[PDB]
RNA sequence: GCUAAACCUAGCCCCAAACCCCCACCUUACUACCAAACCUUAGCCAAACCAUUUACCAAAAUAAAGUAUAGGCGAUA
RNA sequence: GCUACCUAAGAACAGCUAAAAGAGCACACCCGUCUAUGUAGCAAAAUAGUGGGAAGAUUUAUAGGUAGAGGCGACAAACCUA
RNA sequence: CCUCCGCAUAAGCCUGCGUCAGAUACUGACAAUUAACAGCCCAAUAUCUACAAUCAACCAACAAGUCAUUAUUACCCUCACUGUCAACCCAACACAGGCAUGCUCAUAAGGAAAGGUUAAAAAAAGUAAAAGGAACUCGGCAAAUCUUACCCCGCCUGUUUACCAAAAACAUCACCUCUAGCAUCACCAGUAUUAGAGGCACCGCCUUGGCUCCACGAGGGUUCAGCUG
RNA sequence: UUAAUUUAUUAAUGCAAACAGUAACCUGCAUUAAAAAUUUCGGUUGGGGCG
């Protein structure tokens, strides 16, 4: 069954006076004519082009005739894709373990709230002119606050000055993987860097723990289920920066949702392979930017974070990047899911309940702050 | 009237698309069919027929994992999203396929009559004789146009040197050449046919209003 | 299209009918084109081809309106054209073969201004001869130099 | 209901007002943030000269002589332009790279 | 100018020179106590704010700061001895504001 | 019906016509490590950011100058906390809307059914500032109430539609930038960034010198009034119980290079006929003349950096409630 | 109920109903015009 | 004695002769500038109903001649 | 451009009771049961009180489609510009 | 002293109570609605989008739902054009009618039922009425005070003859019977649990059905009680 | 409509007509159906009808 409906599709031009078929004979045409007559054989007019081109209506040459065109089958992830898997899937791309607790470290650095009150209050509350403000308008002034809660914490933790959050950094980063090329293209959200590297969170044990660990398959489903299937790709690595950038090292990655419509959100699970591969992409290309560009397993391992959208439901994440040798030794990856600050807000009164957030829980805010403070 | 049918799209896609309707009514504008009209608005699953239809540059039997068995609104059983390989689909889902089961397309004619579960689909050699299966097409690769109602099942009553003969729903009995795939099972929304109506309203929003005048005579 | 009595009976209902001739897709070779047409003709038109001995004799013999048809009458001045220039119209290697055909209708043989225009409508014939007598004007610096060039030559004479 | 006043563009709904327009002439293009982008080249340059230390001034006298009226025909003006050639015994054979283009006209008024 | 079919311009060509401008306006008494440095304009139907504001510097060599403009339509209401409509006509009128607080203020003719 | 009033704005002699409107005397001037950043954001927005899409001249405000505010504000916040204790509690607002809703005036209706009646002249300031800093107490106050002030506020004698101004029927909203029930109601410093049609490249194009000042202060004079008289309304006064202690703040306006800095001052809510036929005092608004912050960029660096602009913001953000 | 208002105007349907282009569209509307010329109206269309 | 009443040329009719007619505008016409024509007339009407039929219209003086001829062999042609 | 039906993309539906029902009372709106006025009328079907539905088989704006022995119809020979 | 009024946009009109002058909102002349609101859009080739909404959070469904871009190629020249008035539109009328959406809930806006008398009849509308309380009448129609029960019909909510009929009629769930084994312009991007056509009338029990049978009705009758010109 | 006349149009047959052969679709002519299409529905009568 062929989709693509006849009466839809373009029908076949009429047939041609047969004055073409008759050999050799010049019709008559209304061509001499400019215009239509309805005697007067139709001509055949050449296939115009035209000899400079315009800005304003350009054509795209197809997809054979480009300058960077690669033959082997290509994919990329880049910030609209939702993997069917998930956080497996995501597992077996960037070939990493997965740790379901927040490192000890980050909780030692967790071991002022009615800011955190009116933080909540002022995104879903008391910040737009009507009632009820949408998604879009409170999720981004959630994690602006939180951000500038910490940079508020300067004071008891005075090397924050070296490190600065940027607002629409591109990146890219590849990898083989059977072998069979991928590629992550950059963020649109908050970029935490700093002008100093994170310190290294798991030992040589665990990395070799890690070796001895095996992935996991998942079966029939292909590993590339998801990717985009991409063409021409220009397959050179990228950290969105000019060389000789200050505050170089990616500290932390604000990963945040609009579109309060839920089919338009991520789900959770797609959410943390988001982060997953993200964190991989900015590790990578900071590991090929500093390194070079061969397969190894890096002596100085990278550590990258991430955190989740959705300012009601939170995600940390903690990525060590040891390993540029793909398709042997795993990356590690310290998550955690659903932290679930406020789980509701009544917005306007139920007819018995006032306004204002349900559920609250402030351990998740002491993650936020260590998961920053990380590095200093 | 300036009627282009709704059904212009050409890559078979996953999403919904935006479903037209159509209020019983032709190209040339007037009332062809009585009895439609306004109903809830709709949106269409593509889905594809052809149970045996191995993705790019691939091979013979391959395997498939259920993502989510769903309602569909145009039609009467259930759809599965399913996954396999680098792409994915929609297939009429059997009945008791939940969200996790693998089902098997195979194009292999064993010559023992395969020990199949109830999901899964293969030609009518690989079938055993007397089994119940739904989604029947007639020359192999054309695609099942048969059994695939909800709860229906035809019977596979014989096997032939070069055909067999399916016992269709309607006590009827249909020659099949013996090389075309159909799946095994019967099909998801049993209990349907014991649906009441109930309201007017409820048909009304079924799609289906009252028509006088049916005989344009 | 015409009338017709009920039962071969005038005191009966008269009443509407519409005669159609029978259609065939016939393959056709022409030995003057080289050519192999398909065609909707009918067994008129098959018998003709027989009593003309080929469909050559039978387009050039036919008169405009016995052939009723344009594309007939394409074919005929084709086909008289193709004559009266005596084109290579196989190729070359077979010149005495070509000389064969045209000596086998050598008698249909009209002047090349005449063959172009054999078989034209007259919204074609008009189309054709504006078409001969466009002529982009000729710029009057180019008369007038003419003219005086010519003046100044006849005063050096006198 | 009157077919018998003008249609103008103060003669419709909202889309109608804003799609017709007198008949002022298009000075850019329109894009995608409905933006729209002036071509400098597409606003017309006055060339206005300098008119100062200049005689002539918008009336004459009413003892300027009466002269009897003589169109410039195309032999009058070949004649006073090529003399000339009657002196040895211009012209433009085409006009592709030519700038005021004359008989399909690339220049206004 | 006006009434003149323009040249197109494709991508690079040259500029839209007019010699010879068709355009002629007419400085008028504003009727509803505009401010100092707002002159008033009577103009074709066919020009615009930057087609005026070149006119009135490259011509007169007035330094304008901000052209508006607006439609004014003339009644239809009048009918004649044959009860057929009378139209008076539709102008464009622009409201030129001066630059360097320049401040024109309309004389008195007529004393 | 009432007139929207736009702070930035186009029209010539706005600022003028916003004191008429607003009932504010305009009196000219005023009542390191952070040097390394200042200068570290700033190459990061023009150059130091890698760019796909290339940009444009059309969206070189809004792509560059924009997130240039957001972060050196946002980092001016956090490094001057410590320095002061008001901006660990303050909040800060990225482009929240900043209405202000007043009567000015009366008119007689010049024709229509009601032609010949009174109609009060209702404007409303409807405003996105780039980003603003509130406190939950009262700043300073400059100057005691019900100053002196011999200049003498202009007595615009047109229509206000005159200057290009349009009247509008909508929802009349009065708002700081967030709801009545926020405890950080006060504000302190507010930052707004000029947009591309108002760019003084193309003022130059155009045809004036000072009106680049005149844009500047006019921006001043709408935002500062809408957010002082909305903090105002806010703590209960209205156009007829007057405000007793007098409201203030202080806004900076550039235009990613230019800057100039404003204080403001409101004395008055009463600026209805009935309340201003006998009322003395007038609003006042202190401005700076407009200076540049750098002159160039030459892709790694800053040319002409200038101290007095960055130490201007500083000291603003720099004071604190009493 | 009162019914003197059939004529509910609106310049979209009066023009695409009536209008220049659907006349010359349709060959029928083509004599319409052609009519009105020889009758010598002074508007064809709407 | 009010209201009126009166008027004569504006033109028209039939013949003869002679063959006649800058810009914008098919998009919502009167809007500067973007990827297909060709197929029997029917019926009222006469036949005192109506059912075959029923003048001419689809360039053709006078006469032959309303003749030969057709035709519910009738109206009629 | 009325009206019948359909299509496309929109919108409206107070409060109380109730707790997703072609729910109850009842506004907005939709309709038109009874009476009275009216009858060259305010109106070529209105007015005034009384009434029925009012989260639905609802009402409704805008654009489009179906055309005359045809359309359209929850059949009333109903409607298709008095 | 009045008002589901008023203000705004939309649609429709097209200068239609602005100034002056003149004659007896008419006539003429002169003025005027100024863009920030709104409209007039989008360079494409390939491709990506299973997840509703409803405070969206538990939780609840069925009738299964509108809001979404990416890799690359070319693209910095910048803000034009048009709408903008009013006491307005559709009803032949300065028409008690028709007229979408936002906002105000009696108005901060808008308006005036009486030309001046008199105070007959008949007519319209209202209010009050002794005693009695349907005796009126086709009928408690209208008013006045609120209520009860029984039948007939139709199961219900719905629809209908625009402008004399709103019903017992039509439709409707339910059930039966008849036709149809199939692909791309309806039915249908469907497949016998489906589609098309006709008929009866919900339902519990039993096989032109029949007997029960609950709820509902501006349907058609009947009774009690009150209440009333 | 179980009145008269027709199937011109559609349908399903048959017969030819136009192909493949081996020791379906189009056209012409018939038929029976369907939908129709045309047309009519005398007179006397102690009103007209019934008779
Ligand atoms: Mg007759
Ligand atoms: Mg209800
Ligand atoms: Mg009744
Ligand atoms: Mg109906
Ligand atoms: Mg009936
Ligand atoms: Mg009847
Ligand atoms: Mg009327
Ligand atoms: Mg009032
Ligand atoms: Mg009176
Ligand atoms: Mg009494
Ligand atoms: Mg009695
Ligand atoms: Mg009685
Ligand atoms: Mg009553
Ligand atoms: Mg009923
Ligand atoms: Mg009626
Ligand atoms: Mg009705
Ligand atoms: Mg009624
Ligand atoms: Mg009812
Ligand atoms: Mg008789």
Redesign the pocket.
């Known amino acids: 069954?062929?989709?693509?409906?006849?009466?839809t599709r373009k029908s076949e031009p009429?047939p041609l006076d047969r004055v073409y078929e008759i050999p050799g004979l010049e019709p008559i045409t209304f061509a001499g004519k400019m215009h239509?007559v309805?005697?007067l054989a139709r001509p055949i007019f050449p296939?115009?082009?035209?000899g400079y081109?315009?800005?304003?209506?350009?054509?795209?040459?197809?997809?054979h005739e480009?300058?960077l065109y690669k033959d082997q089958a290509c994919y990329?992830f880049?910030?609209?894709?939702?993997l069917?898997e998930g956080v497996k899937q995501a597992l077996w791309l960037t070939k990493t373990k997965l740790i379901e607790g927040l490192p000890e470290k980050v909780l030692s650095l967790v071991d002022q709230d009615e800011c955190v009150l009116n933080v909540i209050s002022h995104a879903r509350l008391w910040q737009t002119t009507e009632e009820?403000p949408?998604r879009e308008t409170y999720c981004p002034v959630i994690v602006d606050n939180l951000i500038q809660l910490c940079k508020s914490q300067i004071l008891k933790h005075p090397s924050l000055a070296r490190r600065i959050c940027v607002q629409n950094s591109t990146f890219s980063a590849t990898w083989n993987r059977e072998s069979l090329l991928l590629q992550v293209?950059?963020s649109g959200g908050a970029r935490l860097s700093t002008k100093d590297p994170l310190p290294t969170i798991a030992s040589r044990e665990e990395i070799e723990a890690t070796k001895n660990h095996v992935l996991e398959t998942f079966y029939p489903i292909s590993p590339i289920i998801?990717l985009?299937?991409?063409?021409?790709?220009?397959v050179k690595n990228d950290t969105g920066f000019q060389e000789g950038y200050p505050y170089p090292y990616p500290h932390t990655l604000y990963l945040l949702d609009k579109?309060?419509?839920?089919?338009?959100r991520l789900?959770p699970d797609?959410l943390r392979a988001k982060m997953i591969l993200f964190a991989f992409g900015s590790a990578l290309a900071q590991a090929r930017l500093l390194y070079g560009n061969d397969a190894k397993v890096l002596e100085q391992p990278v550590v990258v974070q991430s955190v989740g959208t959705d300012g009601?439901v939170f995600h940390f994440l903690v990525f060590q990047l040891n390993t540029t040798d793909l398709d042997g030794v795993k990356n590690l990856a310290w998550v955690d899911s659903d932290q679930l600050l406020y789980?509701?807000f009544?917005?306007?009164?139920?007819?018995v309940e006032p306004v204002g957030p349900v559920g609250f829980k402030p351990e998740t805010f002491r993650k936020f702050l260590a998961l920053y403070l990380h590095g200093a | 009237?300036?009627?282009?049918?709704w059904?212009?799209?050409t890559?078979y896609?996953?999403?919904?698309?935006?479903?037209?309707?159509?209020?019983?009514?032709?190209?040339?504008?007037?009332?062809?069919?009585?009895?439609?009209?306004?109903?809830?608005?709709?949106?269409?699953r593509?889905?594809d027929?052809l149970r045996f239809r191995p993705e790019e540059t691939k091979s013979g039997p391959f395997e498939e994992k259920v993502?989510?068995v769903?309602?569909?609104?145009?039609?009467?059983?259930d759809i599965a999203?399913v996954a396999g390989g680098s792409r994915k689909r929609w297939i009429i889902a059997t009945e008791n396929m939940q969200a996790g089961d693998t089902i098997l397309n195979s194009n292999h004619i064993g010559r023992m009559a395969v020990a199949a579960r109830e999901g899964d689909a293969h030609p009518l050699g690989a079938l055993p004789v007397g089994t119940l299966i739904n989604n029947v097409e007639?020359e192999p690769g054309?695609?099942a146009?048969?059994?695939?109602?909800?709860?229906?099942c035809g019977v596979l009553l014989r096997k032939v040197n070069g055909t067999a003969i399916i016992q269709?729903?309607?006590k009827?009995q249909?020659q099949v050449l013996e090389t075309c795939v159909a799946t095994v099972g019967?099909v998801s929304?049993?209990?349907?046919?014991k649906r009441?109506?109930?309201?007017?309203?409820?048909?009304?929003?079924?799609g289906?209003?009252?028509?006088?005048?049916?005989?344009?005579? | 299209?015409?009338?017709?009595?009920?039962?071969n009976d005038?005191?009966?209902?008269?009443?509407?009918?519409?005669?159609?001739?029978?259609?065939?897709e016939r393959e056709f070779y022409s030995e003057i084109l080289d050519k192999k047409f398909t065609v909707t003709v009918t067994?008129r038109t098959l018998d003709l081809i027989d009593e003309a001995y080929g469909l050559d004799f039978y387009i050039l013999k036919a008169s405009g309106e016995d052939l009723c048809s344009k594309f007939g009458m394409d074919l005929k001045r084709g086909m008289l054209l193709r004559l009266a220039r005596q084109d290579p119209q196989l190729h070359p290697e077979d010149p005495e073969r070509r000389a064969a055909i045209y000596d086998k209708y050598k008698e249909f043989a009209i002047p090349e201004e005449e063959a172009e225009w054999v078989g034209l409508t007259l919204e074609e014939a008009i189309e054709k001869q504006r078409l001969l007598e466009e002529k982009d004007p000729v710029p009057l610096f180019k008369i007038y130099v003419a003219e005086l060039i010519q003046q100044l030559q006849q005063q050096a004479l006198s | 209901?009157?077919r018998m006043?003008k249609?103008?563009?103060?003669?419709?709904?909202?889309?109608?007002?804003?799609?017709?327009?007198?008949?002022?002439?298009?000075?850019?293009?329109?894009?995608?943030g409905?933006?729209?982008?002036?071509?400098?080249e597409?606003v017309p340059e006055f060339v206005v000269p300098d008119l100062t230390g200049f005689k002539l001034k918008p009336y004459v006298s009413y003892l300027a002589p009466e002269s009897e009226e003589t169109p410039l025909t195309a032999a009058q003006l070949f004649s006073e332009a090529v003399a000339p050639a009657i002196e040895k015994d211009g012209f433009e054979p085409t006009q592709e790279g030519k700038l005021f283009q004359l008989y399909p006209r690339n220049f206004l008024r | 100018a006006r009434?003149?079919?323009?040249?197109?311009?494709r991508l690079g060509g040259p500029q839209l020179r007019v010699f010879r401008t068709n355009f002629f306006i007419q400085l008028?008494?504003?009727?509803?106590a505009?401010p100092e440095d707002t002159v008033?304009f009577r103009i074709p139907?066919e020009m615009?704010?930057?087609d005026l504001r070149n006119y009135l510097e490259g011509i007169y060599n007035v330094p304008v700061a901000a052209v508006?403009?607006?439609?004014?339509?003339?009644?239809?209401?009048?009918?004649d001895h044959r009860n057929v409509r009378i139209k008076?006509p539709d102008y464009?009128?622009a409201?030129v504001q001066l630059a360097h607080g320049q401040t024109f203020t309309f004389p008195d003719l007529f004393p | 019906?009432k007139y929207?009033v736009?702070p930035?704005?186009?029209?010539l002699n706005?600022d003028r016509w916003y004191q008429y409107f607003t009932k504010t005397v305009f009196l000219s001037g005023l009542p390191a490590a952070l040097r390394a950043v200042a200068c570290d954001c700033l190459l990061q927005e023009h150059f130091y950011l890698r760019r796909?899409?290339?940009?444009?001249?059309?969206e070189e405000s809004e792509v560059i100058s924009l997130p240039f505010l957001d972060q050196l504000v946002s980092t001016l916040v956090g490094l001057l906390s410590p320095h002061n204790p008001a901006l660990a509690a303050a909040a800060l607002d990225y482009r929240c809307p900043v209405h202000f809703y007043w009567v000015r005036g009366e008119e007689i209706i010049?024709?229509?059914?009601?032609?010949g009646?009174?109609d009060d002249l209702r404007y409303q300031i409807d405003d996105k500032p780039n980003n603003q800093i509130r406190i939950s107490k009262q700043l300073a106050e400059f100057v005691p109430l019900d100053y002196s002030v011999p200049i003498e506020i202009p007595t615009i004698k047109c229509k206000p539609?005159?200057?290009?101004?349009?009247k509008?029927?909508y929802e009349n909203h009065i708002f700081v930038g967030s709801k009545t029930a926020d405890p950080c109601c006060y504000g302190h410093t507010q930052f707004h960034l000029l947009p591309?049609?108002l760019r003084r490249e193309?003022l130059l194009?155009q045809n004036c010198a000072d009106q680049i000042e005149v844009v500047f202060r006019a921006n001043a004079i709408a935002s500062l009034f809408a957010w002082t008289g909305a903090q105002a309304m806010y703590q209960g006064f209205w156009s007829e119980a007057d405000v007793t202690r007098p409201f203030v703040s202080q806004a900076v306006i550039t235009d990613g290079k230019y800057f100039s800095f404003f204080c403001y001052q409101l004395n008055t809510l009463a600026l209805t006929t009935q309340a201003d036929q006998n009322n003395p005092r007038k609003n006042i608004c202190w401005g700076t003349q407009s200076k540049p912050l750098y002159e160039t960029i030459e892709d790694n660096d800053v040319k002409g950096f200038n101290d007095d602009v960055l130490l201007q913001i500083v000291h603003f953000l720099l004071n604190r409630p009493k | 109920?009162?019914?003197?208002?059939?004529?509910?105007?609106?310049?979209?349907?009066?023009?695409?109903?009536?209008?220049?282009?659907?006349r010359?569209?349709t060959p029928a509307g083509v004599q319409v015009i052609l009519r009105r010329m020889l009758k010598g109206r002074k508007?064809?269309?709407?």
């Not at chain 2, 919904?16 to 504008?29: A, E, F, I, L, N």
């Not at chain 2, 009441?196 to 079924?206: S, T």
């Not at chain 6, 930035?8 to 029209?11: D, E, G, I, P």
């Open positions: 069954y062929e989709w693509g409906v006849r009466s009429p239509f309805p005697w296939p115009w082009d035209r081109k315009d800005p304003r209506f350009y054509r795209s040459p197809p997809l480009h300058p990329i880049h910030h609209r894709c939702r069917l009820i949408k293209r950059g998801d985009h299937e991409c063409n021409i790709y220009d579109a309060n419509l839920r089919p338009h789900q797609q009601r789980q509701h009544w917005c306007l009164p139920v007819i | 009237a300036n009627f282009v049918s059904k212009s799209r890559k896609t996953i999403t919904p698309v935006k479903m037209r309707k159509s209020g019983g009514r032709d190209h040339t504008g007037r009332i062809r069919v009585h009895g439609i009209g306004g109903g809830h608005k709709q949106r269409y593509m889905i027929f993502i989510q769903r309602y569909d609104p145009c039609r009467s059983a999203l007639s054309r695609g146009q048969y059994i695939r109602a909800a709860g229906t269709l729903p309607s009827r249909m019967r929304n049993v209990d349907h046919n009441v109506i109930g309201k007017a309203g409820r048909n009304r929003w079924l289906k209003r009252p028509n006088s005048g049916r005989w344009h005579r | 299209l015409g009338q017709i009595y009920a039962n005038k005191l009966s209902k008269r009443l509407k009918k519409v005669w159609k001739p029978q259609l065939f067994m | 209901a009157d006043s249609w103008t563009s103060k003669r419709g709904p909202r889309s109608f007002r804003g799609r017709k327009g007198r008949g002022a002439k298009g000075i850019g293009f329109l894009t995608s409905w933006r729209f982008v002036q071509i400098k597409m | 009434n003149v079919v323009y040249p197109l311009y008028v008494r504003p009727g509803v505009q008033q139907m615009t704010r930057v508006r403009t607006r439609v004014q339509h003339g009644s239809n209401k009048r009918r008076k464009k009128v409201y | 019906m929207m736009y930035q704005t186009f029209a706005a796909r899409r290339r940009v444009h001249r059309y010049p024709r229509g059914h009601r032609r009646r009174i539609d005159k200057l290009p101004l349009f509008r029927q591309d049609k193309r194009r | 109920k009162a019914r003197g208002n059939e004529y509910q105007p609106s310049n979209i349907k009066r023009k695409n109903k009536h209008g220049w282009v659907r010359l569209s508007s064809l269309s709407h």
